[PDB]
Amino acid sequence: DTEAPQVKSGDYVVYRGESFEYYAEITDNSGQVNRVVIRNVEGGANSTYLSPNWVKYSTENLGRPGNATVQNPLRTRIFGEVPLNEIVNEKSYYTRYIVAWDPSGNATQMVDNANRNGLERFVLTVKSQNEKYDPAESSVTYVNNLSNLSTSEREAVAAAVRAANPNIPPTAKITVSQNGTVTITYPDKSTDTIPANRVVKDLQI
Numbered sequence: 001d002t003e004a005p006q007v008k009s010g011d012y013v014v015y016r017g018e019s020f021e022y023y024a025e026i027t028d029n030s031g032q033v034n035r036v037v038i039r040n041v042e043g044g045a046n047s048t049y050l051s052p053n054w055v056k057y058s059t060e061n062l063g064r065p066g067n068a069t070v071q072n073p074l075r076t077r078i079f080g081e082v083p084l085n086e087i088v089n090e091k092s093y094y095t096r097y098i099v100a101w102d103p104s105g106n107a108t109q110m111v112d113n114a115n116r117n118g119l120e121r122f123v124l125t126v127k128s129q130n131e132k133y134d135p136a137e138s139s140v141t142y143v144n145n146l147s148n149l150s151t152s153e154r155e156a157v158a159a160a161v162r163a164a165n166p167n168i169p170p171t172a173k174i175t176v177s178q179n180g181t182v183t184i185t186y187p188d189k190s191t192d193t194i195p196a197n198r199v200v201k202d203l204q205i
């Protein structure tokens with residue numbers, strides 16, 4: 001065996017305040033994989049160093065024959081809970097490498113090129129919480145006057161938004177302004193906005 005185990009990963013996007021779960025498929029021509037390590041480029045062959053500390057991983061049934069074939073690939077779970085204080089800007093990504101060893105000691109090669117992304121090399125992209133959610137079209141709340149929404153009227157718009165969006169975090173704050181504009185403030189303090197014309201109407205015309 002002169003061929004190392006091959007890896008197919010993916011575009012791993014994660015969000016602040018949310019759990020994530022991705023899987024990579026590892027195959028080898030020997031049909032067996034004895035070890036899987038996910039790590040930073042820096043370090044020696046033996047380096048297991050992986051940052052950020054909240055990125056966890058596990059692989060079941062390691063070191064067993066036929067655990068990494070084309071018909072039934074070895075699966076590696078890449079999971080964790082992104083903290084709320086993680087930094088996001090526009091270059092908020094960590095390029096990491098998946099290294100697996102077959103019984104011969106052959107290890108997946110780490111090549112520093114963007115054309116390998118989604119194979120042994122993957123990009124973990126950390127985004128704000130708001131990017132995970134796309135607010136659904138909620139039921140229209142008919143109000144008395146579009147300039148002048150009352151406190152109960154604004155409470156009814158928040159609730160309608162909540163009714164049409166059950167997936168949004170229970171602790172996310174939905175607030176409505178005097179003219180009906182909706183602001184969803186997630187646990188990490190990012191925000192989405194819904195224009196008033198999509199959620200409130202009156203019969204003043």
Ligand SMILES: CC(=O)N[C@@H]1[C@@H](O)[C@H](O[C@@H]2O[C@H](CO)[C@H](O)[C@H](O[C@]3(C(=O)O)C[C@H](O)[C@@H](NC(C)=O)[C@H]([C@H](O)[C@H](O)CO)O3)[C@H]2O)[C@@H](CO)O[C@H]1O
Pocket residue numbers: 040041042051091092093094095096112
């Ligand atoms: C200490 C040292 O010498 N290490 C170098 C390492 O710096 C150097 O560059 C790293 O190469 C990898 C590719 O293997 C990436 O290109 C790293 O760049 C980026 C990344 O993609 O990960 C950009 C991103 O903008 C940065 N993220 C944030 C949030 O800032 C990350 C991030 O700094 C690191 O991931 C943190 O661990 O870096 C790049 O830095 C490589 C080869 O270029 O050589 C090692 O010896």
Ligand code: NA
Pocket residue numbers: 001002003004005028029030102106
């Ligand atoms: Na092999």
Ligand code: NA
Pocket residue numbers: 130131132133134135192
């Ligand atoms: Na969004």
